[PDB]
Amino acid sequence: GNYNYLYRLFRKSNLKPFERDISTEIYQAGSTPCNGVKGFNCYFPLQSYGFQPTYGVGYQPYRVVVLSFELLHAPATVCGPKKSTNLVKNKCVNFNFNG
Amino acid sequence: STIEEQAKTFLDKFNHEAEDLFYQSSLASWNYNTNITEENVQNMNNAGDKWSAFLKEQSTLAQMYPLQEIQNLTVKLQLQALQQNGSSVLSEDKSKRLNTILNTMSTIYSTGKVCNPDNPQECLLLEPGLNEIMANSLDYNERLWAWESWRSEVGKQLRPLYEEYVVLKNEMARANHYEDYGDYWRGDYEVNGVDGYDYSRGQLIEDVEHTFEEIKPLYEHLHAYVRAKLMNAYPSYISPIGCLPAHLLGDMWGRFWTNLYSLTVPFGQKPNIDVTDAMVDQAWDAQRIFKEAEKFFVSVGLPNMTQGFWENSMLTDPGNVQKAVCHPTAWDLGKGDFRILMCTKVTMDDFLTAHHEMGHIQYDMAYAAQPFLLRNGANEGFHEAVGEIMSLSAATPKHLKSIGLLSPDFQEDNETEINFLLKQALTIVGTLPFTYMLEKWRWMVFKGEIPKDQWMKKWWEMKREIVGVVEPVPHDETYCDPASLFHVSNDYSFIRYYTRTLYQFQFQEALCQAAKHEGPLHKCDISNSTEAGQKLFNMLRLGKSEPWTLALENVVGAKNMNVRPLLNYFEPLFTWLKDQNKNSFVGWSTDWSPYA
Ligand SMILES: *[C@@H]1O[C@H](CO)[C@@H](O)[C@H](O)[C@H]1NC(C)=O
Ligand SMILES: *[C@@H]1O[C@H](CO)[C@@H](O)[C@H](O)[C@H]1NC(C)=O
Ligand SMILES: *[C@@H]1O[C@H](CO)[C@@H](O)[C@H](O)[C@H]1NC(C)=O
Ligand SMILES: *[C@@H]1O[C@H](CO)[C@@H](O)[C@H](O)[C@H]1NC(C)=O
Ligand SMILES: *[C@@H]1O[C@H](CO)[C@@H](O)[C@H](O)[C@H]1NC(C)=O
Ligand SMILES: *[C@@H]1O[C@H](CO)[C@@H](O)[C@H](O)[C@H]1NC(C)=O
């Protein structure tokens, strides 16, 4: 069982987009103060996923990479590669050199 | 903030950690069952102790949330399931005594070895040493010797243990605000809080009597026919007017009558529907058996098995070097892990058992979306009933012809249907009065209607009245004759087989009406019917989230268990038995006329 991967199970409010919460403060589900001890009505936010090889496909670990593409008023410089059609000389051709 | 949201978060944390711990415990039990080794026993015991301690701590923490401030029915159901004390309400000395009594009954039943006096150099255990003798012998005094000697040893060991057991279980049940332990067992069918669909603990006994009063003529005719055939087999022992001798029923206790099919066959000259030789000729592996079962379940519209099922299940006996339990068991280990542990042979019985256990697997897969503590059947009857309907559908000659296992020129006349229905009645109908009599006797023992000095005088009186089976010789109060059976000696409910038997034919009528089958009910096959699978899966997906009355409304359209589908299933056999019992006398006499 691999207990190195965790997830935040509780919080008072929902997250904003692209927010990271790495706080390890005890969740208060009740009126009584937790006072740092995981007693009655006070639980720990991060819970592990006990990843075992014999799990179902809906419980197996999946690595997720999310690529976020934004355009800002600065000049865009991370450009996808363009191709290079084999240069032909001594003929009337339509040339496109660097725009 | 509110109590309900606090309970919901507590249930969420409970669920999350419970699923993982139940997985660890179930995986340890799996590793014990596929590999009987002492370190696997130690790992199983450690995981079970952790699971029980975790259930104790969550039961201790769940009670602090009062029930009446929660309005959501599913949350209230999970909190009701969690807040049960169990044995924790009892004192530590009496709880330890009860656990010790249960463990020593388990050791007495498992390691009970009985053989003939004056020949003690080797002895035979119950499985398979005594089972084969009870199922295959034709000698009166040998079966009488085995029956009386095993009830002598087991009853004289277990009688003070059972006398302590009833008192401790009644003390635990009255400490849990129940009338008796029988009320605790009947509380599984208790539905409270739903308008119209409420079911009471006291309504269960009345419904069982009401259904058994309609069971009784069919069982009387079957008993008369079996009595006449056993009179033909044994000339002088059986009386025309009296009950059947106890040791002649084909099994150790009378649980099933399916070992009397050779003696009581109507038309021996006609062939059987045995397909074993056809699979041997076509070399059908157990993998092919499970793939044909998967083809059956995808034909009705249910989901197919996962890759982890095929990777992680043991569908063949491993060998001599590695020991495993031979009993077929479907395991829902948790987290989408579904396995079958069966030592599958090339027989019809193993093929039907494969369909039955894959029906168990389909039932477990259907409620995987539910929360962890609601991942069960709506009652104890549905879980077995959804496997028994697959055992019904797979056994049909239409299914065997469809998959190619039976010859296309096999003649389906009325005589083969009559003897097949008689075999199914000996398996299915014959266990019903024994089950009802055993559960009613245990309910009267727990309720205190029967004093301890009068347990057996009433019990045989019940068996003559209900089962129509007479004792060979009278037994005094030094015997403990019920507790020689596995379920009663190891603290298991027994009404699940009665409810399973009635729900089986109710589900069969509902799915055959869904599949638009136009013939007899026993000729019906639920393959190729998407709508029958959808009607099944609507109930299957609920799990324990909904009441069993509402689930039965979802399947059959009735709010209560019904006896008419069983009588409709055996109606050709019922007419045939009524024709065959014209000269003979239906019914029995409680007097000592055969033997005492
Ligand atoms: C069963 O246990 C034995 C004992 O160590 C072990 O050698 C064997 O590999 C186990 N079987 C499997 C399938 O792991
Ligand atoms: C009860 O709680 C479940 C989640 O646990 C929720 O999906 C369902 O809608 C709730 N029912 C009611 C009536 O609030
Ligand atoms: C469980 O037992 C405790 C006392 O040991 C009791 O207060 C509690 O009410 C019991 N639970 C239920 C559901 O009755
Ligand atoms: C189950 O069915 C799906 C869809 O037909 C298929 O993709 C999948 O491979 C099947 N599973 C197995 C184990 O064959
Ligand atoms: C089967 O049908 C034939 C003709 O319909 C009849 O003569 C025979 O008695 C029937 N047998 C049984 C067991 O019903
Ligand atoms: C049910 O479907 C399977 C798969 O298409 C097919 O082989 C079988 O013949 C069908 N059953 C009938 C009775 O046609």
Q: DSSP letter for A2, please.
A: B
The whole-angstrom distance between B307's CA and the closest CA on chain A is: 8
Q: Which tokens sit at B503?
A: 């729900």
Alpha-carbon distance of A84 to B513, in angstroms, equals: 69
Tell me the C-alpha distance between B397 and B282, whole Å: 18
Pair of tokens at residue B511: 């799915």
- Closest alpha carbon within chain A to B7: A41
Could you give the CA distance from residue B111 to residue B264 in angstroms, rounded to a whole number? 34
Closest CA to B112 of B55, B70, B153: B153
Dist CA B374 CA B3 (whole Å): 21
CA distances (Å), origin B64, targets A26, A37, A40, B58, B178:
20, 18, 9, 10, 21
Q: Is B307 in the pocket of ligand 4 (CB under 6 A)?
A: yes
User: What would the two tokens of residue B120 be?
Assistant: 């003690």
How many angstroms separate the Cα of B457 from the Cα of each of B244, B463, B464, B513, B592? 18, 10, 11, 46, 14
CA distance B378 to B539: 9
Residue B271 C-alpha from the chain's centroid = 30
Closest residue (by CA) to atom 14 of ligand 5?
A: B414
DSSP string, A12-51: SSPPPTT------PPEE-SSS--TTS--TTEE-SEEE--B
In the chain, the amino acid numbered B139 is D
Resolution to 1 decimal place, in Å: 2.6
**CA–CA dist B485, B488 (Å, integer):** 6
Nearest CA in chain A to B63: A40
Ligand 3 and B59: CB distance under 6 A: no
Of ligand 4's atoms, which has the minimum distance to the CA of residue B309? Answer: 13
Task: Collect all residues with Cβ–Cβ distance below 8 Å to B453 and sequence separation of at least 6.
Answer: B477
Which one of B6, B20, B308 has the shortest CB-CB distance to A56? Answer: B308
Q: How many CA atoms lie within 13 A of B198 on its CB side?
A: 7
Pairing mode, strands B124-125 and B113-114: antiparallel
**Nearest CB to A55 within list B1, B10, B336:** B336
DSSP B267-301: -SSSPP---HHHHHHHT--HHHHHHHHHHHHHHTT
**Residue B247 annotated to the active site:** no
Interface test with A, best of B8, B13, B306 (most A CBs within 10 A): B13
Residue B93: is it exposed, middle or buried by C-beta count within 10 angstroms (0-12/13-18/19+)?
Answer: exposed
Asked if B9 lies within 8 A of A10 by C-beta distance, the reply is yes
How many other C-beta atoms are found inside a 10 Å radius of the C-beta of residue B494?
A: 16
3 state SS of B338:
strand
Nearest alpha carbon to residue B53 among B12, B21, B11, B16: B21
Write the Ramachandran bin of A81: left for phi over 0, alpha for psi from -120 to 50, otherwise beta: beta
* Sign, Cα dihedral of B68, B73, B75, B80: positive
Q: In angstroms, what is the C-alpha Rg of chain A?
A: 26
| Share in percent of chain B as helix, strand, coil (round to 5) | 65, 5, 35
Method: cryo-EM
Chain centre to alpha carbon of residue B111 = 23
Instruction: Tell the residue number behind the tokens 């009597």, with chain if given.
Output: B209
How many helical (H) and strand (E) elements, i.e. helices and strands, does chain B have? 23, 6
In which region does residue A90 sit, left (phi positive, over 0), alpha (psi from -120 to 50) or beta (all else)?
left
Tokens of B323: 């020991």
Helices (H), B111-252: 131-136, 140-175, 181-186, 201-233
Structure tokens at B203: 């309504």
Helices (DSSP H) in B409-485: which residue ranges?
414-428, 431-447, 455-462
Distances (CA, A) of B489 to B154, B188, B549: 10, 20, 31
Distance, in Å, from the CA atom of B55 to the CA atom of B87, rounded to the nearest integer, reads: 12
- Do the chains contact at A9 and B335, CB–CB below 8 Å? no
B75 Cα–ligand 2 center, Å:
7
Beta bridge partners of A47: A7
Shortest distance between the Cα of B294 and any Cα of chain A, in A, equals 18
Supply φ then ψ for residue A48, to 5 degrees: -85, 155
- Neighbouring CB atoms inside 10 A of B302's CB total 21
CA distance B130 to A79: 81
Which tokens hold the place of B297?
Answer: 């379940």
